[PDB]
From Swiss-Prot:
The keyword Nuclease applies. GO terms for molecular function: RNA binding; RNA endonuclease activity. This is Ribonuclease. It is found in: Secreted.
Amino acid sequence: VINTFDGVADYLQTYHKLPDNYITKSEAQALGWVASKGNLADVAPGKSIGGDIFSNREGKLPGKSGRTWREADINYTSGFRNSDRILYSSDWLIYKTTDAYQTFTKIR
């Protein structure tokens, strides 16, 4: 269990998998996610949104003719998302934001 940027990176960089508490919007949606509520700790106690893919629809991540980008929530407990998010590239690049994708800072 963990919800910190470096914690997710260490966990993933070592076990190449997201912490035992990261489920993407994919499942969050079929699981029964609703905008007029933003559920999470209820249907997923101690869990966070992450594991999808980030089609760099912001021109804020390094691209290449053969690679992929994925996002994941950061610093969460029980409620909804926030402005803290982590971006991990298929090239093993680690990117982090704090204003909600607005700006981005690299960490590893």
